[PDB]
Amino acid sequence: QEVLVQSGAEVKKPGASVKVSCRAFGYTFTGNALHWVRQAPGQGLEWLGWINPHSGDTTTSQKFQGRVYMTRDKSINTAYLDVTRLTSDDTAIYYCARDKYYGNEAVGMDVWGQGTTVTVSSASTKGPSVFPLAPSSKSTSGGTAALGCLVKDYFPEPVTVSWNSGALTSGVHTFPAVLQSSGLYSLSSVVTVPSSSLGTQTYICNVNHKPSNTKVDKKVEPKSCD
Amino acid sequence: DIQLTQSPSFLSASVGDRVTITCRASQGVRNELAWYQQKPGKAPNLLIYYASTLQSGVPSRFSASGSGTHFTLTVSSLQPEDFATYFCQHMSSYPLTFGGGTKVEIKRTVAAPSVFIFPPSDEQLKSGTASVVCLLNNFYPREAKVQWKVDNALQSGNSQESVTEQDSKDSTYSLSSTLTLSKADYEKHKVYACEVTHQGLSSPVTKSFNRGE
């Protein structure tokens, strides 16, 4: 069918530039205007501009003029978005989206790319530190104990977290990451389990961070008091 | 720029209900207005354009009306797959702008959170920082007040919350609040408490511990 496929995630330092691509399949690329829209984490949708892929003419929103550039290459059905002089305020998911373009006017955005995440920060690649969130007899609730791992100070997103190599899935909540004031990300993953079997069960969180090529395990054990 | 103001911004509803979402434009945009649905982790999908034309592939329980500055999207006979965020967008002049969104979440019975507090690990303290985590598990509705009290003094500015999306199985939320202190500030105080206020709790619940015990 009619689809738009974007290039992969990008990570940049402030002042750098990024070029995102978007390739059209299943329809005549030059038959429809193409928009670029971004969405920062937890926020709404912001229009950057649009391009006529037939003629190459563009319109850029006022706030991006002289900084964002839209081009295309008809030989590979591809549109490009170049965002220059990047700052951390440009961290967002960037989408390309086709307009229905009936009558050669804007009507609505009917086919969207999958998005491209762009992270801009002065931070450098860093794997997480992983700390146990240990269960304690004092924290028992009914028949339940909660336990987890704190996955702290990594850059960029994402990490993956499993428990017991994927054998433990019920009762797990892996929270969305937060961007800390240091500019590094952190999250926690928690699980509820029976209090009765804390002395005999095993709980290992498996935390992988592909940008740093790191894979960490942390066993999480009940607190004892001497 | 044209400002599109949606109301309500947040709504709770049940399967079978009819939802009415309004978009008001700061100046007239004729019929040059579209509506979209967005689910977490996904691009938006087009529902309506020309203010009232339904996009192919959209069920007929979606309908819309309006012109000028007042538009309305109506979703009748709400289905499980309709719980999502909805946005309007105009295209009458540059720049194109979008409304702020209306999130439609599913109603269920009130469920109080189970509350747990985690002191910092000895491993982390060895590194110069202390993170204290308070977990609120499997609760509804989403509104919850989580306050940190350290030797009876209310904390501000040193904690961050994270919330899950509404669970697809049980329609609850879970929430973490993390208090982060330098080791120097952690060592200033003894009693660490998280106090939780929620509709399902007859009075607030406090979980606490003493540093170094």
């Binding site: 003629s55 563009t58 009558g103 050669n104 | -």
Partner: peptide
């Protein structure tokens, strides 16, 4: 509505 020209 806004437009960005012909496409053929």
């Amino acid at each position: 509505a806004v437009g960005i020209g012909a496409v053929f």
